[PDB]
User: Which sequence fits this backbone?
């Protein structure tokens, strides 16, 4: 009799899922923004005090989207006037507020359009990037000092990444790294002089008479890449009438051979920095640990402190090589790498020795190292119940790898199987974050007694609202393909009657090291399709997917568009044989890589799918960026992998689309998967005489995330889907 | 029992409509390309001879799309390697073939990428434009002489028009004019230095890794326009070691005041040239007749030889002021202008007097003056039967305006009501071209006996094919609106049963001075919709339409988007009341201006239309070019017509689209109605929460005319239409 989860409920977020975001500022204290008030909580006693009243934000231009308190707690930074750029980058305005004299620094302010800013790890120094140059302010009220002079739009980047490093290498816009005690400021410089430009029209507000052309240095497969340099600036000598004292650290010879990338920076101590470089091929990476020479100011490296990591069956790491986690002394480190069996586990390395020792093993994988003390190492893995789509926090004794405890496994076995964690300094306390399968749950714990100090947020409000509505259920299970067991999930309609025949909707991603099958709780479009439209929405992780060993992940090496596409078809074929699926009404959709896979499926002529929707899909790999594409496909030259580049385009399967109903969608301002991709795909379908539907979204980028576009696209795909399934 | 005219029949042109293209080369001879053979016909005796065997084209690179024989018949020009640009412009390669020594000129050839080329009116001189500069060749085998040095891509144009002059002023790419006896070569120079650039992406062949950006100097409403200069070059002194002798003719002071355009050039005699200029406003034009001064080389003008033409209720002429037609002596001319009642008729002017005398009158209009001898004047009008959508050839005695004969009216009253004509030199013979309502019919006639020498093409083959198929019928009639009678047409399905109720498709254009209702025979998409899908396709010419007097045409002056849109709604409303139309299923579609109107109707909230399709529509007048837009709307400034510019956008009616099914289509490479227009329109619909369909066509220009795109768009609109009409 109750209501169903509606499209409007989804599009409007009428069912709010709460969370708990905190920032640790010591080994037992943390800040929390509550009702626009910044409160200081003491993990020990649970008591809190007001750190900054809600009545201070009231007048800072307008909305204050973010804050950052200096480590010495003397100042606070206010971020506002946010202007988004790519996936991670953006520019903003900042105000510095003196917490002592409780005033607002007015002289020597931070520039407008600041690209990045950060306090030093200690004290209250500031470093920021503006107009592609780096500046340092020793005091909030004193004049900043310019560190670089080469900054230049679309050419030289100091302190921040260019387009490709942001998206594929750093997964961040930032390229600045203060040393632990603020002595040194390390940064990377990117040169895009020889990178070709992708250009597209941005129409802007209706009042703009002429469209403007956006230009981005974007390297497509096999094109010229940006070069990079790494510098360590000694901030001690920074003065208005002094030059900048900096040293340039170059990569090891084994990398200087040809094109390469800087993929990681980690400070070990005030005089020891760790750099991780990888060759353009991405099957050879190396860690170079450089020591500061106090009598020359040089950062020296030695072959003894270099650690090589290669891959013979594919690429190194998941999306990039894993980061090293050093001990306080810096004489050793722990890092995730592939073991003998192809599973990723933690290996213990000695800084000046090449041999490492695995401290974990099994047919499961370590997702990442979370914290490290002199006695324990905390990490996250999907070992529990052997569920690759589950996550838990584990702790292992460093003096006896035999003693490993699961800190999250049994807290709420039914409600919580997917966690992430955030540790305080020195790992004395930690917040545990549960994302499903039940309602998210945030908790605070002590590392000494493993006791649960308290419940930070349990979403009891959401629970209330949902018991009044007919929610669908999510079931996870397994099936066999090629003698290998793979996972899949199904969002089943309320009051699921294994008798009736329901229409199926396959939602796919399926890109290298992907995971669409997990135990995370999500109020999604699928929630609505199952709840209101009685459609079954399933997902499957086959060959190429991650967190199940290099064996399954590297299956699609140098051959994207083959096995992962084929496995979606065979898995759907097995789903359609289970009596509760109307094989006459099967569809599939995806975004990005899921859009590519969706298209490849539809064009396979399997006769299995009736219709499909592709949103901002890749259509030809030579159109995508160099870092991501080459990592799996090599170079598109007749000497390397051109043949597999050519027969993996969606265009080459155009004729087969005559057998299905296809919906192609794309944002005209997509800086990531260029509109070109869909423009070229549609032209191939037109030339083949194939009828299909289209939908462009003016000025929307890769996310197609503006409030109105977001609502419009899901509304549109719903009509298309219901038309195809003959649903009223 | 027979077949119906199918979509495939239309898309593939299975039913060929033949024509007869000839080129007059004297007062009694003409050339005709037959089976790749150039034959020379003698109108007098009807006998023909081979002028150039089909066996000469065989090897000229490849296909020879066109030929041009010099007037002295000594040479012939072969055009090939055609590369289209805008609506009229294109570049090509040319070979000169010596008809005497029957050889092929090999030395001093014509450049590749030639923009325009033409023989002189006599002899065998040649003038051509290459890289925006003019060149003259006195002999096919001799070196050409460069005439201009200012040529520059997207900036200076010598001898050819820029984008806006090509599309809106000259309706041609050409800007060169030889004098009657080849002495002088006149040309216009266009400067686009200050014209803003419209830019858009061209994706090209799938193999192009990066899309290229096309840039065109295009002036939008109120923007900076291109300036122009007119020169008369004396070719007699052209020599390799001599400078160029030329004179610059400037416009009359009444035009130099502000911005203006050169809209017409006409040579009167070897020493008298006629220039027609118009102000940017386009409600004031003037004809300046300049005489050559043999002792100074100057081209002099006098106030006595100037003729002003203004409009107080709108703009001058139809799309541009009509051209003057001078007598051999050049002492007088005949030109179409609006009379006292607002109807366009022929006025007789004296070159040095300001008063003219109308030689025709009535509630009908003269379409154009076709030929002029010392005894008669031939013209075309829609006077017959008072049908504004009919055309006929008339002849009027110059010494007695009372004697006027209709030469085409009664030849085939049932089969032919729409003619055009082509006269030989001195008007001794003429070809008559009938375009409907029956099958096209070409005939050759003598001016002396008005006798029909012979039938050039009667399409008897097409007649044969069509009697085997169920063709629809076209009926023309009238209806009253605001006390004024307007015309409309309906393509009725075969075996039309005035009983049953059929869905109605309204095909609209309705732009200023347009005519959708005529008696021309057309194998169109509508032919298929009526014949096979049993849909009625109607068209209506209301306020704003042409050929019915300035009264009706100037109705929409300074207010586009109002009356012509409203009249389509009221006329459809009256059509729906006629018992044979299903009021529940009515649609409307259009192209360009028809797309605008179509969209303005769908957004009127009249409740009359269920669905509609708009192809490459204008959505906001400030986005269209200056010449066309300003002609009807004035300037978009608060001092002029900004208010009507703002409330006539399609966007302002977005909310109303929630009541209809809308299909928006646009070529991404449209240089005319920029993709911007539809991009901005769709964004307004998305912001309003309106659901609608879309369809972009990669790299297609304004015509969307590539073979595959052509077939695809009509196939797509047919599915949309049938979905909306619930037709299987
Ligand atoms: C591209 O072409 C290759 C080579 O023909 C395809 O690889 C074969 O795929 C078939 C599946 O139909 C397998 O039976 C063979 O074992 C494969 N051979 C190799 C060399 O792996 C590949 O599937 C094609 N890729 C795409 C995207 O269609
Ligand atoms: C094309 O038109 C532009 C006007 O914009 C001319 O440029 C001006 O030329 C004069 C004289 O040389 C200079 O004093 C101005 O400074 C120029 N202004 C600009 C906008 O550049 C240009 O010379 C013209 N070219 C031709 C071939 O006529
Ligand atoms: C700043 O802080 C006060 C609390 O100290 C906020 O007041 C609370 O508001 C929530 C709902 O918004 C109530 O449920 C609490 O009970 C309120 N507490 C009090 C003091 O009554 C106040 O809303 C905040 N100011 C702003 C900017 O909204
Ligand atoms: C918007 O501009 C004017 C503003 O009123 C509109 O008004 C005109 O058209 C009406 C038709 O409903 C007439 O009733 C008004 O009298 C007439 N106003 C004037 C001053 O003559 C006009 O129609 C609108 N144009 C568009 C495109 O919507
Ligand atoms: C919490 O209370 C303790 C005493 O039990 C005090 O020492 C501490 O400073 C307080 N922490 C806060 C809320 O800052
Ligand atoms: C950027 O790279 C280009 C191309 O190699 C080079 O010419 C230029 O000097 C470099 N600039 C800097 C600041 O490194
Ligand atoms: C730095 O130099 C400027 C003049 O160039 C001078 O005004 C200022 O006093 C100097 N600062 C220091 C550190 O003395
Ligand atoms: C590393 O990748 C390159 C790129 O093709 C390849 O030639 C080489 O064999 C690879 N090396 C390993 C360790 O597999
Ligand atoms: C037709 O024949 C006549 C002979 O009476 C001749 O004069 C004429 O040139 C011929 N027509 C042509 C040009 O083929
Ligand atoms: C014309 O100029 C050319 C180029 O300098 C020269 O070779 C030629 O002799 C000149 N013609 C004469 C002789 O007048
Ligand atoms: C000519 O047209 C312009 C266009 O705005 C107008 O301002 C001017 O008054 C008009 N004059 C005549 C003769 O109609
Ligand atoms: C060219 O014309 C001749 C005329 O005799 C004709 O017979 C021949 O078929 C034609 N050749 C072609 C197809 O070009
Ligand atoms: N850029 C890497 C990703 C991608 C791949 C193909 C297409 C779009 C986006 C894959 C993982 C995050 C985004
Ligand atoms: N520009 C001239 C035309 C037009 C008008 C509006 C929109 C597109 C095209 C009007 C007549 C021919 C084409």
Assistant:
């Amino acid at each position: 009799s109750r209501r169903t989860y509606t499209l409007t409920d989804y599009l409007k977020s009428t069912f709010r899922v709460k969370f708990y975001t905190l920032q640790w500022i010591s080994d037992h204290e943390y800040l929390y923004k509550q009702e626009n008030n910044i409160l200081l909580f003491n993990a020990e006693y649970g008591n809190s005090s007001i750190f900054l009243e809600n009545s201070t934000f009231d007048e800072l231009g307008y909305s204050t989207n973010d804050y950052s308190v200096s480590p010495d707690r003397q100042f606070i930074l206010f971020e506002y006037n946010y202007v988004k750029q790519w996936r991670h980058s953006y520019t903003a305005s900042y105000d510095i507020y003196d917490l002592n004299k409780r005033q607002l620094i007015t002289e020597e302010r931070i520039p407008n359009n600041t690209q990045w800013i950060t306090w030093s790890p200690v004290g209250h120094k500031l470093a920021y990037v503006w107009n592609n140059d780096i500046y340092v302010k020793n005091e909030p009220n004193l004049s900043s000092q310019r560190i670089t002079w080469t900054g230049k739009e679309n050419v030289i980047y100091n302190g921040v990444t260019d387009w490709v490093y942001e998206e594929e290498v750093f997964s961040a816009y930032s390229a600045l790294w203060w040393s632990p005690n603020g002595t040194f400021l390390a940064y990377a410089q990117f040169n895009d002089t020889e990178v070709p430009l992708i250009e597209y029209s941005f129409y802007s507000d209706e009042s703009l008479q002429y469209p403007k052309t956006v230009r981005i240095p974007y390297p497509k497969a096999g094109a010229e890449n940006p070069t990079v340099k790494f510098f360590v600036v000694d901030t001690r000598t920074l003065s208005p009438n002094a030059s900048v004292t900096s040293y340039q650290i170059v990569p090891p010879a084994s990398v200087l051979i040809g094109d390469h990338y800087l993929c990681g920076v980690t400070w070990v101590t005030e005089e020891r920095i760790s750099l991780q470089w990888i060759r353009r091929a991405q099957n050879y990476s190396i860690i170079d640990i450089c020591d500061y020479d106090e009598s020359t100011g040089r950062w020296i490296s030695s072959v003894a402190r270099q650690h090589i990591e290669i891959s013979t069956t594919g690429w190194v790491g998941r999306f990039r090589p894993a980061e090293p986690h050093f001990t306080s002394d810096g004489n050793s480190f722990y890092k995730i790498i592939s073991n003998e069996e192809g599973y990723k586990h933690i290996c213990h390395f000695q800084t000046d020795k090449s041999n490492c020792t695995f401290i974990t093993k099994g047919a499961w994988e370590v997702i990442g190292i979370e914290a490290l003390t002199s006695d324990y190492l905390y990490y996250i893995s999907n070992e529990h119940k052997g569920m690759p789509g589950g996550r838990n926090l584990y702790r292992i004794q460093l003096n006896d790898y035999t003693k490993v405890t699961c800190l999250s496994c049994e807290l709420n076995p039914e409600r919580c199987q997917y966690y992430s964690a955030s540790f305080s300094n020195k790992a004395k306390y930690y917040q545990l974050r549960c994302f499903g399968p039940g309602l998210p749950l945030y908790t605070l714990h002590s590392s000494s007694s493993d006791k649960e100090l308290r419940v930070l947020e349990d979403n009891s409000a959401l629970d209330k609202m949902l018991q009044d509505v007919q929610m669908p259920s999510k079931k996870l299970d397994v099936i066999n393909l090629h003698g290998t067991k793979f996972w899949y999930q199904m969002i089943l309609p309320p009051h699921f009657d294994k008798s009736k025949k329901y229409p199926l909707l396959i939602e796919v991603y399926a890109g290298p090291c992907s995971q669409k099958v997990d135990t995370v709780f999500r109020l999604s479009w699928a929630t609505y399709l199952a709840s209101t439209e009685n459609i079954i929405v399933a997902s499957f992780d086959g060959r190429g997917s991650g967190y199940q060993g290099d064996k399954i992940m590297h299956a699609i090496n140098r051959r994207l568009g083959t096995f992962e596409v084929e496995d979606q078809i065979e898995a759907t074929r097995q789903f359609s044989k289970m009596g509760f699926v109307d094989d006459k009404r099967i569809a599939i959709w995806g975004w990005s890589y899921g859009g590519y896979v969706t298209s490849m499926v539809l064009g396979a002529g399997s006769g299995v799918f009736k219709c499909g929707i592709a949103v901002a899909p890749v259509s030809k790999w030579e159109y995508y960026d160099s870092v991501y594409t080459e990592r799996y496909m090599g170079l598109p030259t007749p000497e390397d992998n051109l043949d597999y580049y050519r027969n993996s385009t969606v265009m080459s399967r155009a004729e087969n689309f005559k057998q299905v109903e296809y919906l192609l969608i794309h944002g005209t301002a997509d800086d990531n998967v260029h509109f070109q991709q869909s423009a070229q795909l549609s032209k191939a379908l037109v030339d083949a005489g194939v009828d299909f539907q289209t939908m462009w979204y003016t000025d929307e980028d890769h996310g197609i995330a503006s409030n109105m576009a977001h609502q419009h696209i899901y509304t549109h795909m719903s009509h298309f889907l219901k038309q195809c399934f003959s649903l009223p």
